């Protein structure tokens, strides 16, 4: 109802062009809006929405450490947005240098790659700034996901991974259990880490320890995902995200052997080996024996995931369901995963419950916290896989999924644990057990027989009188 209003504003600001350049508008304006809320509220103690040279950067170096900027003492959202026909042109690419560089300290570069100083026209440009940032200046509350429009501007084509929040809630409540520990938290191959937002801004007063060292390919996606959490007070003083490819650069390799991680491995994650560098003889693919091929290198990531692992803290990943064990090219891989219980449990899901897949995935939960027994504790449905307007708090199931994941709850029409030797007795079910007993009816011979007999005997005289009436 309020998000209906915010939703309609999100619809209408899309007129008349898409959020590739409106990325810059929304992020810069909402960023300095957050500054004029928070940073200026630090220096309210009642004076200025129209902020002026009252910052005292000698003493305002503390948010230049903590908010990692003195952004614009003289170049505010009020001190840049007034008129038509001024001097000069250039206010959106280069020379807001003192917040963009901001080397002292904890700088986290490529921080302000949206709008600094240039610049195309005189005040078509700067009056575009004036009028549009003034029409955005008054977009009031009507604050946790106050960039819901930004959660829809990144979802503009999404109405490939753009964080389905029900799946994200499922991973975060399935990060449970065995979680009040250190560190909190690691994420490899993150992307749009708002799954980390409902994983930690939900757990903010619960436990908050360490930075979220995601790693994605697309640099604009990287930067928007970095500032995305920071939009709604998730601190980026030191809690940050690294850039690169995750196998050529699995930094930090030293810090540390992690305990609790999550991820969504996407597609477009394949790579060619096998291996030409010394990743042929690395710490993770020499335990694999055979190595990740040119296309199905998704299976490298779990090999990466055990590389960053401890026994107590458990790790939730997902893969699209091209894993039964994928032949002898991956069997020993699977066998390595059932050399011990390196993999602990698996969970299936329902198609779609995503953005247009329409396939399920396979959740793989990995800890070296063994019983030992093979786990097939899966449930396809339900998992009411329609939309996000029914069963919105719980799915009536996240407590039930939580209980099955808790301790070995072996409920029919749902799969249960099998023997550790059963998966090597069988040819590595993933997952065929159990899929119990749908649509098996049985009726009475007399009831199905006499009723048919009666309705036929109706039909015979109907046929005869029809032939009577078939006469002209």
């Amino acid at each position: 109802e309020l998000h209906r209003q915010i939703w309609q504003i999100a619809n209408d600001v899309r007129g008349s062009v898409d959020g590739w350049d409106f990325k810059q508008y929304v992020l810069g304006a909402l960023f300095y809006r957050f500054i004029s809320e928070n940073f200026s509220s630090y220096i309210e103690a009642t004076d200025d929405i129209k902020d002026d040279a009252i910052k005292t950067k000698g003493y305002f170096i503390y948010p230049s450490q903590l908010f990692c900027n003195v952004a614009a003492k003289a170049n505010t959202n009020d001190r840049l947005n007034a008129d038509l026909n001024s001097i000069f042109v250039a206010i959106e690419s280069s020379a807001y240098g003192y917040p963009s560089e901001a080397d002292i300290k904890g700088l986290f570069a490529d921080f302000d790659t949206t709008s600094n100083r240039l610049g195309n026209t005189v005040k078509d440009k700067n009056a575009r700034l004036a009028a549009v940032l003034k029409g955005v200046e008054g977009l009031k509350l009507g604050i946790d996901l106050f960039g819901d429009a930004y959660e829809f501007l990144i979802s503009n084509y999404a109405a490939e991974f753009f964080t389905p929040q029900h799946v994200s809630k499922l991973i975060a409540q399935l990060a449970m259990h065995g979680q009040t520990h250190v560190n909190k938290i690691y994420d490899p191959a993150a992307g749009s880490g708002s799954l980390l937002l409902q994983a930690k801004k939900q757990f903010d007063n619960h436990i908050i320890e360490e930075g979220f060292f995601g790693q994605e390919i697309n640099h604009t996606t990287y930067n928007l995902a970095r500032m995305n959490m920071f939009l709604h007070n998730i601190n980026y003083d030191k809690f940050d995200i690294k850039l690169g490819n995750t196998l050529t650069e699995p930094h930090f390799r030293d810090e540390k052997p992690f305990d609790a991680i999550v991820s969504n491995p996407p597609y477009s994650v394949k790579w060619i080996g096998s291996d030409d560098p010394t990743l042929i003889n690395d710490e993770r693919f020499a335990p694999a024996g055979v190595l990740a091929p040119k296309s199905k290198a998704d299976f490298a990531f779990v090999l990466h995931a055990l590389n960053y692992l401890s026994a107590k803290g458990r790790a939730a990943i997902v893969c699209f369901p091209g894993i039964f064990y994928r032949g002898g090219a991956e069997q020993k891989i699977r066998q390595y995963l059932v050399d011990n219980n390196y993999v602990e449990t698996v969970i299936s899901l329902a198609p779609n419950l995503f953005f247009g897949t329409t396939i399920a995935v396979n959740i793989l939960v990995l800890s070296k916290h063994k019983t030992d027994t093979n786990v097939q504790f899966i449930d396809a449905s339900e998992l009411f896989k329609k939309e996000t307007n029914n069963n919105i708090l719980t799915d009536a199931h996240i407590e039930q999924i939580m209980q099955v994941f808790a301790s070995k709850e072996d409920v029919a029409h749902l799969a249960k644990s099998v023997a550790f030797e059963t998966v090597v007795a069988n040819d590595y079910n993933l997952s065929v057990s159990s899929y119990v007993e749908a649509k098996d009816n049985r009726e009475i011979i007399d009831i199905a027989e006499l009723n048919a007999e009666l309705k036929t005997t109706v039909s015979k005289i109907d046929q005869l009188r029809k032939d009577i009436d078939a006469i002209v």
Partner: protein, 384 residues
């Protein structure tokens, strides 16, 4: 029925793939001979059998449709192609198998074999194991005692095929007979223009966010997906009796008829049902009550009878989901006789299509009961 063993599936089976088919043609006209049999039904029409390597010659193999479905089963009856997904199944040992036996024996387990869900090939599943086989009565008396029941079940499958056949024959015949007879009526029957017989209605759309006016009550809310049936007194949806405060609908008596104006016509014949309770409906469709000059069954079947032409009457009125107007749905002269002459001929008409059509006292219902008893007796039988 003593010496019965499970046997592996691909044991006696010569399973194979289709060979190099060049079936990628553009026209398959009936002057050509061999069926280009694909998934779904077992018949797209003829093709040239000369110099295309079509197999056609064992007079009883079977197949598997589909890749990713594994449920569509057909006996390769006479002389058939290898059209593009026909993964071929016959036997190695042709002394025991009698594979209409195993054509049945697939669907003896529909609970693990005949369920097509995702994009997965199932070579191990149909290849390996198992099937209860009366081996070691192999081959001699096993095929003999199973020949008894396979004669019975082939007559039951034949029953299924012929009842569908005569259903189609009866429907086609009677639909010809509807308008061969009962047309051109003399004389002289009044050429009453449409809708003038009684004040037909429009409907009215509620608010679905009115939770009081959407869940409770017992007025049957009628949708065009509730339509397509015949004589729907009450629909599936049970909208509120107080919903008439905020629905703008029309209250109907027990002798109303319904009509749609969206989403399926402009292409086909219009659905119609005899609505018989006080029920309500939106602007997606309309309703007619007649008035006193009529018979409401005669009006109903005057709609259904002239359906092939009252589709044409107000036909396009937009190429959208939006379809046939009210205008020339009000503006066509139909023969409407006097009240002494409706009841006899519409009684014969009602009598015939309540012989044929849905559901109880209906041939397809009978077909479905015989389908149920067929599958039940197959379960009953191969419990040896």
């Amino acid at each position: 029925g003593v010496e019965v063993e499970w046997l592996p599936l691909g044991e006696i089976t010569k399973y194979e793939q289709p060979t190099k088919y060049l079936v990628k043609a553009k026209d398959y006209h009936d002057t050509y001979t061999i069926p280009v049999l694909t998934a779904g039904k077992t018949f797209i029409l003829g093709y040239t059998n000369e110099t295309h390597g079509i197999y056609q010659a064992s007079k009883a193999p079977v197949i598997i449709f589909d890749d990713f479905t594994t449920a569509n089963k057909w006996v390769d009856f006479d002389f058939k192609a290898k059209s593009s997904a026909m993964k071929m199944v016959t036997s190695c040992d042709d002394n025991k198998t009698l594979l209409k036996y195993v054509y049945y024996w697939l669907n003896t387990l529909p609970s693990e074999f005949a369920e097509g869900d995702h994009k997965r090939q199932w070579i191990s599943n149909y290849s390996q194991k198992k099937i209860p086989i009366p081996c070691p009565d192999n081959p001699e008396k096993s095929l003999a005692i199973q020949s008894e029941i396979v004669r019975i079940l082939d007559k039951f499958t034949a029953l299924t095929a012929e009842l569908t056949a005569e259903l189609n024959m009866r429907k086609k015949q009677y639909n010809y007979y509807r308008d061969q007879l009962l047309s051109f009526k003399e004389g002289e029957v009044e050429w009453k223009t449409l809708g003038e017989i009684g004040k037909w209605y429009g409907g009215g759309t509620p608010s679905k966010n009115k939770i009081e006016f959407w869940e409770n009550g017992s007025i049957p809310w009628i949708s065009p997906k509730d339509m397509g049936r015949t004589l729907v007194d009450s629909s599936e949806d049970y909208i509120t009796e107080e919903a008439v405060l905020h629905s703008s609908t029309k209250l109907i008596p027990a002798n109303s008829i319904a009509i749609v104006v969206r989403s399926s016509i402009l292409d086909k014949v219009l659905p119609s049902a005899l609505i018989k309770v006080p029920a309500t409906l939106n602007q997606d469709m309309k309703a007619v009550i007649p008035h006193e000059n009529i018979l409401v069954k005669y009006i109903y079947h005057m709609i259904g009878s002239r359906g092939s032409d009252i589709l044409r009457a107000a036909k396009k009125t937009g190429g959208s989901v939006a379809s046939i107007d009210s205008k020339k749905l009000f503006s066509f002269k139909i023969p409407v006789p006097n009240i002494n002459e409706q009841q006899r001929i519409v009684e014969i008409l009602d009598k015939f299509d309540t012989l044929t059509n849905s559901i109880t006292e209906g041939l397809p219902r009978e077909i479905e009961l015989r389908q149920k008893q067929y599958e039940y007796y197959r379960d009953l039988l191969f419990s040896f």
